[PDB]
């Protein structure tokens, strides 16, 4: 599947320029939204929006570029088309065959660090996931903390779910995990 | 139903004083691929991704050539002005819990970088290591800054300390981050 790009339009001591086209999907392909940004220094000066209809200068430093590109049909009409030729295309194209359909099994492990039961869940590719702490069959839900999914960077996640409960020999705490890969809730236990 | 994905298709960056450029594609914050402006080929973060989808590298060099132009114009239209340098922020950690003996990867996060010009290297005990050291392209931050991730695979131990030294113009002196299994 070939993916297509956004196409930066022409303009009428360190310096850094930036351009990027963004495709905001929601519900999958239900509602699409396209946006581009032309960023000079660190100030985004020119922008396009899938909901406004044409280019609009976000700052006065880009009045020129904004006017001109909305005068010429070829430009204005082209950009307004990327919603389909870039967003929808890519989605149904490459994504729906690569990013999207890629699952990863989580590696759940309990441990300790005057103590807090930690339940580290790692290396999974589904944003969503449910981690529930259980006691001797009862679902604890009071001293339960979380640490914000950390994007590892290699398309895997890592999160930590704490628990206060100072453990007393005899009880069995169990870490519960939901579909970040399968449909058989993984369950790590810790006796003693 | 509702709420889902986001894809940046077409991140084009470019610095004038050094003629440095970078082209990348990210989906959901993760980097799909980046185009190599020298070797003129598309490179995939995840190799099993190329065997399914693809990208015309030339479609990258073009946006570099278009942004190069605009850089130039926009420098003249603001009467030539600097951009204050920022102070990068390292944060080291492991990819998986540390289980002595079992190979693991070590991640050196480096948020808030600007301009996109930085040297990140690793140090075992004190000596600089070179094997198993991976690094990503610059990812973008909603405040138009950049963050880069540098990896290092290792074998967890009791007798050793790792470090991630970060060099940047926004630092008169490098500031290695310290990390031990402790």
């Amino acid at each position, epitope marked *: 599947f*070939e993916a*297509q790009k956004a*196409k930066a339009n*022409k303009a009428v001591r360190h310096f850094v320029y930036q351009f990027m086209g963004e495709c905001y999907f929601t519900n999958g392909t239900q509602r699409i939204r396209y946006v581009t940004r032309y960023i000079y220094n660190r100030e985004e000066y020119v922008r396009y929006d899938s909901d406004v209809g044409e280019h609009r200068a976000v700052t006065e430093l880009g009045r020129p570029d904004a006017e001109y590109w909305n005068s010429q049909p*070829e430009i204005l*009409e*082209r950009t307004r*088309a990327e919603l*389909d*030729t870039v967003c929808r*295309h890519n989605y149904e*194209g490459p994504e729906t065959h690569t990013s999207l359909r890629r699952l990863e099994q989580p590696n759940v492990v309990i441990s300790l660090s005057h103590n807090t039961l930690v339940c580290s869940v790692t290396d999974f590719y589904p944003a969503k996931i449910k981690v529930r702490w259980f006691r001797n069959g009862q679902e604890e839900t009071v001293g339960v903390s979380s640490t914000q999914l950390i994007r590892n960077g290699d398309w895997t996640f890592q999160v930590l779910v704490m628990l206060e409960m100072t453990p007393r020999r005899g009880e069995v705490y169990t870490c519960h995990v939901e579909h970040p890969s399968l449909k058989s809730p993984i369950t790590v236990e810790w006796k003693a | 139903i509702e709420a889902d994905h986001v894809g940046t298709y077409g991140i084009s960056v470019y610095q004038s004083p050094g003629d440095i450029g970078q082209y990348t594609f990210e989906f959901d914050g993760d980097e799909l691929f980046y185009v190599d402006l020298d070797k003129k080929e598309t490179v995939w973060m995840l190799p099993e991704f190329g065997q399914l989808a693809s990208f*015309d590298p*030339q*479609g990258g*060099l*073009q946006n570099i*050539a*278009v942004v*190069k*132009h605009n850089l130039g114009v926009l420098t003249k239209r603001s009467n030539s002005t600097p951009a204050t340098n920022e102070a990068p922020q390292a944060t080291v950690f492991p990819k998986s819990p540390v289980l002595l003996g079992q190979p693991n990867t070590l991640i050196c996060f480096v948020d808030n970088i600007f301009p996109p010009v930085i040297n990140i290297t690793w140090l075992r005990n004190s000596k600089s290591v070179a094997d198993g050291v991976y690094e990503t392209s610059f990812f973008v931050n909603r405040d138009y800054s950049f963050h880069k991730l540098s990896y290092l695979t290792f074998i967890p131990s009791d007798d050793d300390i790792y470090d991630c030294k970060v060099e940047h113009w926004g630092l008169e002196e490098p500031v290695l981050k310290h990390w031990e299994p402790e």
Partner: T-cell receptor
Amino acid sequence: QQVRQSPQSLTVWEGETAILNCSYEDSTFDYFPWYHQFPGESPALLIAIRPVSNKKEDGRFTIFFNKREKKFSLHIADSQPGDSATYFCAASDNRIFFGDGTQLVVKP
Amino acid sequence: AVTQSPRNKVAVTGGKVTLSCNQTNNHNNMYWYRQDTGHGLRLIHYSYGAGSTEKGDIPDGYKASRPSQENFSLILELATPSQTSVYFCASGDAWGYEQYFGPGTRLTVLE
């Protein structure tokens, strides 16, 4: 990654309708233009089209684009004898690709 | 508009032929085509800007240059009979809009 122009050479009487067919394979082409080159000099642009069938321009020419089939053709209604020129269909994304060309000849 | 230099040229196999192409627009892109009968227009080289230059369809045998942003020159090191034809030099904007061609150039190569 290359376009196909079939009618190598074509001939039709005045007033008649000439049809020149093209077919491509790549799917990043978001611009399909047509160039006419008179037997005298350099080629020029005639009519182009972007994804979404039908084109009016210079009411005499019409472009039928079929994305589902990745086929498009150029129709010339009431073909005059002066519209005899080699016709090149093209497909563009990063750059342009042309076809074999069709040498049209409208017999007077 | 654009204007090709040698609008006509005859050479022997092994000669160093050089074609020029002065542009006079604010176009950054410049392409060097090559027309023949049965094949039509085929791209040999093109450049997105001065100092830039990309190969095209049949770049073999050639090697172009882009010294300024208003001049793109195609260059034949070792001419060959297989290089006889008409060469066109176009100018244009990025993302494909309309390429503006040149008058043309006829080149012939013989032993």
